[PDB]
Structure formats: structure tokens, C-alpha cells
Amino acid sequence: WIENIPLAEEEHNKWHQDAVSLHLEFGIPRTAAEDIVQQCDVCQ
Amino acid sequence: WIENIPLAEEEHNKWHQDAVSLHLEFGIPRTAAEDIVQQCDVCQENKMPSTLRGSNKRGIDHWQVDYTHYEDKIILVWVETNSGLIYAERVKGETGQEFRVQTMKWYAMFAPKSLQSDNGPAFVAESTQLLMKYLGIEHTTGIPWNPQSQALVERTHQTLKNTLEKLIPMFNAFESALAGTLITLNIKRKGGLGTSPMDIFIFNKEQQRIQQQSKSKQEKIRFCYYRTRKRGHPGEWQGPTQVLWGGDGAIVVKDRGTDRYLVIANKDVKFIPPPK
Amino acid sequence: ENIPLAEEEHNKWHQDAVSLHLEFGIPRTAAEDIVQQCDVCQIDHWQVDYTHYEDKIILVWVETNSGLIYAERVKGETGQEFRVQTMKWYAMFAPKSLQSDNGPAFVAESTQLLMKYLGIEHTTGIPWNPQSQALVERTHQTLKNTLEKLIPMFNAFESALAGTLITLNIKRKGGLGTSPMDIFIFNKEQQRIQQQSKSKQEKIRFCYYRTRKRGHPGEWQGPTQVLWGGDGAIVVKDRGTDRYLVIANKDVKFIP
Amino acid sequence: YRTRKRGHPGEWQGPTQVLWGGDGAIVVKDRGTDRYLVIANKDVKFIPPP
Amino acid sequence: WIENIPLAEEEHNKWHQDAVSLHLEFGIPRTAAEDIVQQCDVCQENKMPSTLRGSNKRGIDHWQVDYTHYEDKIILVWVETNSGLIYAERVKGETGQEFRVQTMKWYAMFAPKSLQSDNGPAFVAESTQLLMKYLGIEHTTGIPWNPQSQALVERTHQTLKNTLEKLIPMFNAFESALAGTLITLNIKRKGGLGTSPMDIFIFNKEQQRIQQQSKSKQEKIRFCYYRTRKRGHPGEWQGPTQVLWGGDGAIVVKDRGTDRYLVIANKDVKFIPPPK
Amino acid sequence: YRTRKRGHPGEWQGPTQVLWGGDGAIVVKDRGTDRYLVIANKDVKFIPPPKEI
Amino acid sequence: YRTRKRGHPGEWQGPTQVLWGGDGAIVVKDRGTDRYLVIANKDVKFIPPPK
């Protein structure tokens, strides 16, 4: 989780998927993933 | 706060706190804040196991026992699980042979079908176990450092010893007073609807009569499909199996998948027409 | 209430109170009251014997009706030991009443007292009933026969004693696969339903009563006893017919 | 009967209706939720109404 | 039909049973059938005292303490009642002199106003008591062999020792780890609204201030009256007392009769007009 | 997990895996004896599965 | 499914699996004797699907 969770935060800035996709990739919290995608200006 | 988190994480790694205070002061979502101490070593280590546990109502004639040392008197105690009618007897030694004889007596008083009992050697003894087996009976093991599986017998050791303290001066015999306590709580203790355990055991022996159960076979079976809705959309009838018993608005059924009895509301039932 | 209709049938046919209970599903102390109140024919009721086997005094307990029993090894036939034994025996059951001979432990003052302490009908006397006595005899014969089967097989005499108690009370069955256990049990059911439902409530009450003719209330009649007060009903004998009747409590005037 | 309760077995519940006898459990309605359920027969205590 | 009762009474005096079975079999009213065992000696004597009890958070600056042996380390623990912020310190001996010094320290850290503490001799010591007195402070006695008045300090001995088991490897010092636990639960434990005890103590010290508290005297008083209904019929008005504070639909008042604060719904109030 | 010797509980041990779950106690393997065991929940200190991994 | 004795149709049995669809009959196991069996489609009543 909390080792996955930063790394996915790193990786979304690269690869910009769904929060869904990272929840389902890394097995993180989805809502945190959603927080990244919102806090990711790029998908915004 | 999403990136406050590694610092908050550090502050757990430093200062090792609850998911809450950490959640709030770092102002995050709390749930991964719990996944902290899930992922902590330290705080993961030393927490206690909150665990409720359970005792078994279990079976008609299913039983539970422990020996007693009342006033330096070994008293071995014969105590039902389901409706918790009991028996006991004073004993000179706890030994497996002695024990085996005691249970021969008490077993002969009834058709006790099974048992929970602890790690005491006489319970545990080889020919004791072979005797349960010899008679086609289920011993089960009260386990180390759980009197609590042995709950009721210890409970009743309480109840009984209170009653002893009443009655024993009234008698020549301690063991007639033992009879008196035995009498009373297997009988004279009556409650709810004002019924003993004895009521309930014996009643249920009438209730558990095999001939009646065998007889109900003549009553009709139907089968029924149940099915399951994913995003609103019910599955195939899963399978089709007997309406074990119908209720109003739902039924009794088994999932062979679990091999376990189950409900289906009568809307998600298919009624399956008769042969004809 | 089926009790007065059962009484209607017995007044005709003169059966056993057994089959009155069984036929009509009434109480058995009701039924026993009928046969005792039926001049033509005019539970939890036991008999004991100590018995010697292999130089082992054994106390025995024999229900007079189901025929179900109990027995236990005895050191000596003393009143006091026996007083303990009937503590334990009453422990296993809810016995009402008893027969026995005049045996000293039985007749003894603290023993008879103890029956009274338990509210029991004890009867010592030369036990005279071939109904009972035949069965007690069959019991002891069958019994020590079954000892002679079982006792080699067991570490304990009292375990094999247990064995015979099983054999006869449980494993031994008849009719529809009923052991005297099953009998006894089933009797305790409805009897302890009726006993709670009835005898505890009210005793020795009279009333005036009437009979509705096409729903037209009769004259008030009696005074007669309230024999069994029912739920919304009672039981009464109309003195003229020598027959029992159900009367609804509205057609009752209870005589205070 | 008793079910999940606070955790695992709660405190006892009902008295309810003994509807269908099975092996090891049976279904009784929850008066609270009006809902048919199951109680392990080790979570049961059987009773005659009156 | 209540003349069965003395015999039933005897049957309790003999056979000592529940009010119910006795009630039913003797077929009486049950309630005096309970008054039996109320009046029994035998079935009575031996009953247990069902008693809930209570703890006192008490007023601000009211405190509670016990020593704790942690890993053979005397640690004397300084634990508030009301908002339960705490302190503790490791000690070499429990002694009254040592103790007296410890409390000098901790007392100096605050304005702790009172105490609950047990029968431990150092708590109890003469000059200890004289020291509380010397400073105008209320000791109160944890009674002997009841930790439960000493509740929170034992509770916290739990909490703390869990935290010790975490932290102590992280430090040179056991007592720096003691500082760490101290830190955390007096601070870092934060909950509800995400606040420490430290929050609450200190806050309340701001709210425990005398001047704003004394300033409010300028605000108006009115007095007000009350009466009591016997079989529905209210008494005379039982005098006038200050409306200590008014609420909506009721107020704050004292009965001098009890010398205790009280409510009156504003209908049973007389408002008493001003001087003028 | 831990175990009772004259009642005296063991130290916390392993840790290892939930094999069969039950309410209040489970099945687990003793690594030392390679043997299955039933442990009182009280003496079961729960862990999430992945451990360090 | 049912079975005949001297042509006399036995009582219906199952419901069961159509173990294989045949022409004029099918395959079924007897749950009682644990044996595959064929039943002529007249001695069969097929069961409609969940609808």
C-alpha cells in the first residue's frame, strides 16, 4: 500500500491513467488514487 | 495532505500513534492512515487481539464437563451444551479409569451424543477416547488455556458452590446436598416460561424422535432455481434444487457451492412444476 | 377442553385412563380422576426394591405405569443412604408418588418425613397389585439376566449396571420403537402442561351454571363444584346425568 | 438466537418462531428487520412457547 | 387461596427454590413469592452485590496517581481526573520523601488543585498530607485494595506500557522513551475533534480564569418561586431565589432545602420584577 | 501466536498464516513442528497478510 | 423421469440432469442406485428454463 501508493503517484504523472486503473494496478486506495487524478493537473 | 503523508508516516515511524490523531493533524483521509499501522512493524507488534469468541449451543445431548475441587472434594460435573441441563457426582480421584466408569453411569442415564471437554488426562485418555468411539460419540477438546470453551461447567461450578453453601448443613451427606443442588438447578431453577432445563432436555428428546422425522418424508418436494443480480440483472437459475422448506416470502435452500443452508426471497425463486 | 367428552366416552365404554388420555389428548390425572370417579371401574408413581446381586445391594426404582425404572448399587439398605439415593433419584426426575413394601429404610420416620418434605405420596404396605408386582418381577428377572450378559464386558460393575439400565430403558423398545424412556418423557410433556395449567391455579370452588338451548341461556343450576376450570371454560358434572360438561365462563356464576 | 452481535455472537435474541428444522441451523424471521435469516444451532436455544 | 402459602413457605424453608416454581406449583401470586427469598436467610445471605459504581473526572486540576512497576522500574504517574492529561516519571523508590519531591516537581509544573490516591504509604505519609495541606490542596484517598477509584492511572499503566514496548529500543534512555510515551499520549493521542488532553487542560486553564469569571458579576440577577403538586394540586409558592441562570423554557436554581442546583420549567417560575 | 504452560502464555511467535478461519480461533501451522494448531484468539495477534512484502 | 414394470409406468423421479439428449430418450443417472439410465421421452418430462 503505502509503499505502492507513492510509487503510483510517481507513475501517474508519467502515465496518467484512471484512478481506477491504479487502484486496480497497485492495489491502493481508490479514493486516494482519485485524489491524485484530481491533484494531477494533467488529467484535469 | 496526500503528500503530507510520507512525513506523517515518518511521524508514526518516529512517534508511533493512532490512525486518527495522525489522520486529523495531518488532515488526510484516515483509512490508509490505518494502513499505516497495518504496515507498521512497531505498532503492528504490540496491539492486543480484540476478539469476542463464541460458545456452542451445539447439540441436543451435546455435552460439556469439568471435574471440581470443592472444599478438597473432586466433583465431576456433567453439563449440557444446548439446553444446559446438568448432572454431577463427587469423585475420589480424577483418573481416566474412574472417569470412564463415571461416564458409563451418566451416559447410561441418557443418550448423550457428543462432548466438549478439556485437556485433563482422564478426558484425554486412550481408552476414554476409544470408549467414546466404542459408543459412537463425539468428544471434542477443550483446548489449552480456554476454560471458556469449558464455559458452562465453570459457570455452574459457581452456581453450584453457592447452593452447596446453603444446603450442606441441612444434610448428613455432602453428596445428598450434592443431590439437592443437582435437583434444584436441573429442576427447581425455572425461568422464562418457568421451566427447568429438565423440561427442555426431555421435551427435546420427544422432539428429536426419529420416527416422526422419517415420517415427514411423504410430504412433497419441489425444487427451485435461485439466481443472483449483478448490476440489477439476475443470473441463471443456480442451479435448481429442492425447496427444502418454504416460508412466506422466502424459503429454505442449500447452495451446493457452500454446501450450506440458505434463503431465497420468493421473487428470486423459480417454482418448479410437479411431475404429472 | 376435551375432558368432558372423554368423560362422555368413558361413561359409556369403561376403558383405561391410559387410553382416555391417549384417545382424547386430555390430561392423565384428569383420566385417572375419571376412572377413580367412574364407579364401574371402581402417574409418576413408582415402586422400589433393594436387590442383592453378587453380594451387591442395589436400589431399584420402577415406575408403575410406563414401567420405566432406575436402579443403583448400594452399600447397605440403611434409611440414611437410601435417603441420599432418593435425593438423587428425585434429582433425575419429577416423581409424584410411590409404592413399596414396609422395608425399614422406606417406612422410617425421617424417610416418610422426607417424602413429605418432597410432597410425595409414599405408600408402604404389602405390595398387593398383580399389575405392579408382575412387572416388578419381570423387571428384576430381565435385569439380572442382563447383568449376566453385560458385566464381563466392563471394567466396572456399576458401568455394566449402567449398561443394563440402558438396555431396558432405552435400547429395549416395543410397538413403534418406544422405550419406556420415550413413554415416560411423552407423559411428562402433556402431564406437566396440564398440571401447571390447572392444579396450581384454583381449588375447591363451586358455581352456578346453565345450558344454552339454541343459544338461549338455561336456568341457573347446581350449586356444583368447579372441577377443572379451563381457559374460557370449566368442567362440571351435571348431577342428574352423572356426566361431565364443558361450561363457558359466561354461563358460570362462580360461587365465592 | 444470536448472530454477529457486536462481534461474532452477540447477546441472545428472539424469542422467535422455530420455522424449519435443519441440520446445524434453521431460518427464523428477524422481528427487527422482518427478515428471514439463519442461526447456527449452536447459536440456538429451543423453546416451547407456553 | 393464600393459605397454601405457609406450607409453600415451609417448602422453601425445606427445599429452597425460586419464587416462580413455588409461585406456580403452589399457584399463588408470585410477588410475595419473591418476598420469600427476600425474607429467606438461606436463599438470601449469599447473594452478590450488583453495583455499578462511578469514577470522578471531577473538576479541572483534579488528579490521580499510582506507582507502576515496569520491568522492575518504579514509575510514579501523574494523571488527571477530568480531562485526563497526564505526566509520569521513573523513580528509584516509592518513598514518601522521594514522592514528596516528585510531587513538588509536578505540582510546580501546574496548578493541580486536588488528588485521589491510594493507601500507599508515601501518598499517605504525614508530611505528605501536611504538604498537600501546606499548599492548600485536596488529597483524597483511594480506598484500600480498590484500584478502581485509581482507575485511570491503572488504565494508563496499560496504555503506556504498550507504548513503552514500542519506543524503548528507539532510545538510549528508557526515560527518554518515557518522555516519548509521555509526549505522545499527552499530545499525539488526539481524538474526537482531534485534540490532545493537553489541549483541554490548557484550554480550561484559560477558561478556569478568575477575572472574566469574576467580571460577570455585573450582569443582572433576578430572583424567582416554586410549588409542588400532591394528588395533582400544586402547593403554595415556596419562596424566591435568584435565577442563577435562565435557559429557554427553564432555568438554573438552587433549593436551599437541598442546597443543590436545580431546574424549574419557566411555567412554574415567577419572574420577580426589578428594583426601580 | 503464543501458548500456555501451566497457563502461562508464550511469547508472540512466528508470525505465520491464517489457514482456516473460525470465530474466535482458527487453524495455523507450527513452523517448528510443521504441525497444525488451534489458537485462542486472545493469544492470536492478527496481522495483515503481505507482511514486509 | 419414470420407469416401467410390465409396461406399468413407475412413479416420476428426479428432477435430474439431462445427462445427454437422445432421440426418443435421453440419459439420466438414478440417484438411488447411482447408475446411468435412459428414459423414453414420454417417460420424461423436460423442465423449462428459468424464464
Added chain:
DNA sequence: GCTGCGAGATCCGCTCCGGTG
């Protein structure tokens, strides 16, 4: 393959009966 429950004493709410302006 095994699981905490019941007894004791209080405290509040609901029902039936009676008193008050």
C-alpha cells in the same frame, strides 16, 4: 477442527386504578 454465559441487584418505561382544580 473449535466459539462466554448466567445470577444478582437497580433503573426506567408501560398499564391499571384513584385523586386534583
Added chain:
DNA sequence: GCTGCGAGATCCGCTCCGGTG
């Protein structure tokens, strides 16, 4: 002249947001 509440795991009663016959 004084009073068991607190730490630790689990779960139902609710809402906010997304998917779709």
C-alpha cells in the same frame, strides 16, 4: 468520608459518486 473507564478490534446505520436496462 468515597464511585471502572479505557485501549483494541469489528460492524451496522447513513451519504456521495459512478454505471446502466
Added chain:
DNA sequence: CACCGGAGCGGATCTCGCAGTCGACCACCCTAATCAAGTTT
């Protein structure tokens, strides 16, 4: 646009340890080191 579902948090439910260091001596059942008693190539 109505209905069901995944994710979220306040509230609710259950079990338990703080009480100084803990063992000392019993009774039962099961397992094991050690000594005594025979033969057999």
C-alpha cells in the same frame, strides 16, 4: 431519470488489562530415561 453499487466516516458493539515480584504444592493423563529379567548365534 430511477435503481443498484463502490468508497467513505460517525456511531455502535465486544473483550480486556491496570491493580509490585508471581509461583508452591496437588491430582490426572501421557511420555520417557534407566534397571532387571530371559534367550540367541
Added chain:
DNA sequence: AAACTTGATTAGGGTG
């Protein structure tokens, strides 16, 4: 006369 198996009587591990 070395080795080979089995019964007897006190010392340790799990349970009231």
C-alpha cells in the same frame, strides 16, 4: 560371553 527385546518404577510435558 555380546547383543537384543520387554516389563517395571520413578522423572518430565498438557489439563482441572
